[PDB]
């Protein structure tokens, strides 16, 4: 599908509000598996279960192992631009 840029805004006491699966060791993309109620991803919209995350704030998430992607995603602060796509 089309690659979309999706902006999420959050404060430092909040998480992104997503669960993810996948990564290089699993041969599958970093995929959103859950959007959690009331948290930034749910409020801001634009991110959906089944979306693959290709990059966040210009940080390429391709070929990352699961834990490396989790670390990168968890570190982004404030204004967080996702590059996402459903395939």
């Amino acid at each position: 599908g089309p690659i979309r840029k999706v902006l999420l805004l959050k404060e430092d006491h909040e998480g992104l509000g997503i669960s993810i699966t996948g990564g290089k060791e699993h041969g599958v993309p970093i995929l959103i598996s859950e959007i959690h109620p009331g948290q930034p991803a749910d409020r801001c919209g634009g991110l959906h279960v089944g979306d693959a995350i290709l990059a966040v704030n210009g940080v390429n998430l391709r070929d990352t192992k699961h834990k490396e992607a989790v670390t990168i995603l968890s570190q982004q602060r404030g204004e967080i631009e996702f590059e996402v796509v459903y395939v």
Partner: peptide, 7 residues
């Protein structure tokens, strides 16, 4: 069944 993380 994949390992899942929450962020």
């Amino acid at each position: 069944r994949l390992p899942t993380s929450k962020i």
